[PDB]
Amino acid sequence: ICVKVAVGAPDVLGDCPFSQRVLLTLEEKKLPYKTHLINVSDKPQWFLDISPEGKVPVVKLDGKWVADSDVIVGLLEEKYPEPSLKTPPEFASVGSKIFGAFVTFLKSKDANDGSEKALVDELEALENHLKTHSGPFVAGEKITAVDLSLAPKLYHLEVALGHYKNWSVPESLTSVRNYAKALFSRESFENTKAKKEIVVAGWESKV
Ligand SMILES: N[C@@H](CCC(=O)N[C@@H](CS)C(=O)NCC(=O)O)C(=O)O
């Protein structure tokens, strides 16, 4: 068994945290996979045929192409249940606004707009959960789907805000920092992350 994954070429689309979420899921389930790069920044109709919104990642499972990383990891969970990555529904929303807050802050040219505070507000909510719930991960001792969704977002956050704004996560958010190190140090992450240079380049137009 070998899962086909369509991701963006680093030169044309950058690094995608939603693609790395899928790849992490395959790694953690030890599912073999082959990565096919999509060279196009445009949307040729054969690509919109496999992916209605013209987005990566897309995955080929059971001879059919399926887009959307939320759908993809859920379908991989149903097809390959061991090891289980099911996140208990009550933790599904943990960290959910962080990535969006980071993009606004990264984009912002007005240091007075409140974007930085909005991001710290979301990081603090993650910190509250991690300090008051057994770790290392959001749901406990075992890694689950919510952790593989957050990890590439935390990675892009730290890399991109460190380069474009020499901004780092506040030192007082020690649980968040231990959480990211625990995720970044995993074999699945080291084998699916992009060079910092790719991350930085992917975001240059937005800054
Ligand atoms: N909700 C989708 C989001 C996927 C997504 O937005 N991918 C971006 C790259 S990070 C993309 O393909 N953008 C294509 C474009 O419109 O340029 C998912 O989880 O897979």
Author numbering: 5 to 211
Provide the authors' own sentences about this structure as they appear in the paper:
Cellular compartments maintain a reducing environment by constant recycling of oxidized antioxidants back to their reduced forms, a reaction catalyzed by glutathione reductase (GR) in the case of oxidized glutathione (GSSG) and dehydroascorbate reductase (DHAR) for dehydroascorbate (DHA), the oxidized form of AsA11. Whereas GSH is relatively stable in its oxidized form, DHA undergoes irreversible hydrolysis to diketogluonate (DKG), and therefore, rapid reduction of DHA in cells is critical for effective AsA recycling. Previously, DHAR has been reported to have a bi-uni-uni-uni ping-pong enzymatic mechanism, with GSH and DHA interacting with the catalytic cysteine (Cys20 in AtDHAR2) in separate, sequential binding events. AtDHAR2 crystallized as a monomer and exhibited the classic structural architecture common to the GST super-family, with an all-helical C-terminal domain, and a thioredoxin-like N-terminal domain consisting of a mixture of β-sheets and α-helices.
The crystal structure of AtDHAR2 in complex with GSH was solved by molecular replacement to a resolution of 2.3 Å in space group P21221. GSH was placed into the available electron density of the mFO-DFC difference map at the G-site of AtDHAR2 at full occupancy in a non-covalently bound state. The cysteinyl sulfur of GSH was in close proximity (2.8 Å) to the sulfur atom of Cys20, thereby indicating that the GSH was likely engaged in a mixed disulfide (for which a maximum bond length of 2.3 Å is commonly applied) with Cys20 before disulfide cleavage by X-ray irradiation, a well-characterized phenomenon. The GSH γ-glutamyl is particularly well stabilized, as evidenced by low B-factor values of 24–29 Å2, accepts H-bonds to its carboxylate from a water molecule and from the backbone amide and side-chain hydroxyl of Ser73, and forms a salt bridge interaction with Asp72 via its amine group. The central cysteinyl region of the GSH molecule is stabilized by hydrogen bonding of the carbonyl and amide of the cysteine with the backbone amide and carbonyl groups of Val60. The glycinyl group of GSH is less tightly bound, as reflected by elevated B-factors of 39–48 Å2, forming a single salt bridge with the side-chain amine of Lys47 through its carboxylate. The overall structural fold of AtDHAR2 is almost identical to that of the structures of OsDHAR1 and PgDHAR1, albeit with the inclusion of an additional short-chain helical turn preceding the α1-helix. The introduction of the α1’-helix in AtDHAR2 alters the peptide torsion of Asp19 in such a way as to re-direct its side-chain carboxylate toward the protein interior, forming a hydrogen bond with His160. However, although Lys8 is conserved in AtDHAR2, it is instead positioned at the beginning of the β1-strand, distal from the active site cleft and 19 Å Cα-Cα from the positioning of Lys8 of OsDHAR1, and the equivalent position occupied by a glycine.
